[PDB]
Symmetry: D2
Subunit: 225 residues, 4 copies
């Protein structure tokens, strides 16, 4: 994955479903080109293939629960993600927690497929544990802040700082990014100043009246540091 990163998680919001998924991805794409910043998009599963074939910025799956293709009705396999045009996958988001054993296999398989992999974790210690699995990045996100507009970088900076320290002490190839409550460019800059290599967010971009303008605001700090 490209260095400083901004990941827009569409979750299952109606504002980003159906065609809106492609519109949102395109606004993200324009912002990435205007700023020369790596902006990644994660649409809901139903739109992953469609979105992947509509934009050129990296498109990540919101999750996966199976390694290979096969008889896994209603499941999301890493191989299918690749075959659909995805460039990476987010695993263990607070809203879709995974079993430690599956997660370990999912991180390895995703990597051997050439997919970027980001593992979320609620706090520093769990982030350390996720980092031991070898993902490209670990996203520390305090679940209490998710959707509140109260940025982790301003309301709970210790969690970011402690994660960066723990991870850099044990598995320094693993990058740390953060999320939960990020709503403005300042929240993003604060994250980077705290040692982060990027940010993960949903609400602020997905629910903005002017997605392109908002995304530019949010991604701008990445093209400054």
């Amino acid at each position: 994955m490209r260095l400083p990163i901004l990941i827009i998680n569409f979750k299952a919001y109606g504002e980003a479903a159906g065609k809106r998924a492609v519109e949102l991805a395109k606004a993200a794409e324009r912002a990435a080109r205007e700023l020369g910043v790596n902006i990644v998009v994660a649409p809901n599963h139903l739109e992953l293939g469609l979105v992947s074939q509509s934009v050129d910025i990296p498109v990540y799956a919101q999750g996966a629960d199976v390694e290979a293709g096969g008889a896994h009705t209603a499941h999301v396999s890493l191989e299918n993600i690749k075959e659909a045009g995805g460039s990476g996958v987010i695993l263990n988001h607070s809203e879709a927690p995974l079993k430690l054993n599956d997660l370990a296999r999912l991180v390895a398989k995703a990597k051997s497929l050439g997919l970027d992999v980001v593992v979320c974790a609620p706090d520093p210690r769990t982030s350390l544990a996720a980092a031991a699995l070898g993902p490209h990045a670990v996203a520390v996100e305090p679940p209490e802040l998710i959707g509140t507009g109260r940025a982790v970088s301003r309301y709970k900076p210790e969690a970011i700082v402690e994660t960066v320290g723990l991870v850099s002490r044990h598995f320094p190839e693993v990058s740390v990014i953060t999320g939960a409550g990020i709503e403005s460019g300042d929240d993003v800059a604060a994250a980077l100043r705290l040692g982060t290599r990027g940010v993960l967010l949903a609400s602020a971009a997905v629910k903005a009246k002017d997605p392109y303008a908002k995304i530019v605001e949010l991604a701008k700090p990445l093209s400054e540091l």
Copy 2:
């Protein structure tokens, strides 16, 4: 939902992933128009939106685990399915079993959103319980026969018989379909002769050397009725 139905479940097979999903859906669409039969397609989650916007036959989701849109990363909600262009959803398939309590809620919700709903069950009794929830159809599918090419209509016709009997006795409005091991048109005709209103299959169509031809073979019994 349309009267006699043939549902092709793409599962997570690589042979139906990516662009192949659209190709398979189109072959199904041709067959459907050629025979004047209701052929439905269920691509993997990642290609649902893409497939829905590429064909006019009904496109069903392989499953769902959430009712409404919102902060449900990596989940598939019924509203998102509707927003993606889907017309129905398969629930409780053997490879993705659901809690009875969630199942009762998903069925009702799906119905009010205007989604067709098919609930799978392993045997007659579980199928009877499923039918009590009120789905459009209940699909009796012996898990042992799945993917073996040993058609349920030939190897375990009692399972179809008892299900049609019980459901017609208790919840006559609910239609009964069946699946597992269906490999030929004769298997399909045998299933219909047992009182079924349709069939659910995967292998035979997904792995056929000539999808279109194979699907026509499989669907033909629906038109001959």
Copy 3:
């Protein structure tokens, strides 16, 4: 199981854990003998064997997730419940919802072991589905009321009436009991009056200052009606 029944679910309350489990079961036993009423007790899993060997009233398991003994670390199997001295099992309580497919197998297996089986469901329609599986009894239990003191028989009598009517119309062998919010002898009598053959409760008994006295109050209507 015995005709009119009162089931005290200890859940995981500390007030009923350890030795307290035996103390509570004994107070229940005294009340049962004093009133000539079938009072059943359901301690947490950890105390099931201990309690079973300390009283003579029926002792039910709060749940199970596996049919037979074997390599199932940290699981509760129906055979083990029987070997431990239990006389029955509660399945699909709101706090431990089960997959429909598993629930069906568990009810059948439990009945074949000679165990009493009660299946909970949140509402009438789901209670009907549960009833189709053949348990001895279905316990309609509106989750909104659990632990609130607002008895189901006071605030949602319709739920009881409908469940009773639906079940008696489809599976008359299956009995209907009810639960959630039952706090007094009066809620109990109300329940019986509404067509119920018993009651399921936890808070009122488990948290009573005088268990024996409270249980006598709750069970008393079972001898009257």
Copy 4:
């Protein structure tokens, strides 16, 4: 927990159910006393309280899924384990895999409660992630060898060696034990020579014609190292 340890997991075997749980625990206790070795026992949930009150060797729960007592019908909470007389708990056994996020909270809660905690993992990398959470010990256990009689220490020594290396490299305060396939005193000795501080086994002890004799055989190497 105590230095070199031998944990006998009763799983859900009928041979160790009901009264047999206490019999087995006592045979273990005798062996422990005769050898001056720390032999721990993990009975199925249903017999945990009973066994805890029948022996003085440490009794561990086979698993848990909840932190504190409360309205968690059919669940096993760490507080209830302590209230039942348990000395520790085993988490994430292959037969009961847990979510990383839950695992992190449970490990922390167990230690806070004064309970010993062991986390199982299928391989070195997962064991390393588990060790990041800080349990007293991690038990690398290849799932393919469980119940096969082919000892991990004979058939997959690399798995032990790698785990011991990785864990002592990152979290040296966390101990390593191993399990799966262990059937003889030689397999245990071989495990200890590979850097392990103990062993976890089930079949060999549970299904022995002479439990006491077998357990003495298995535990003997602990008195020699």
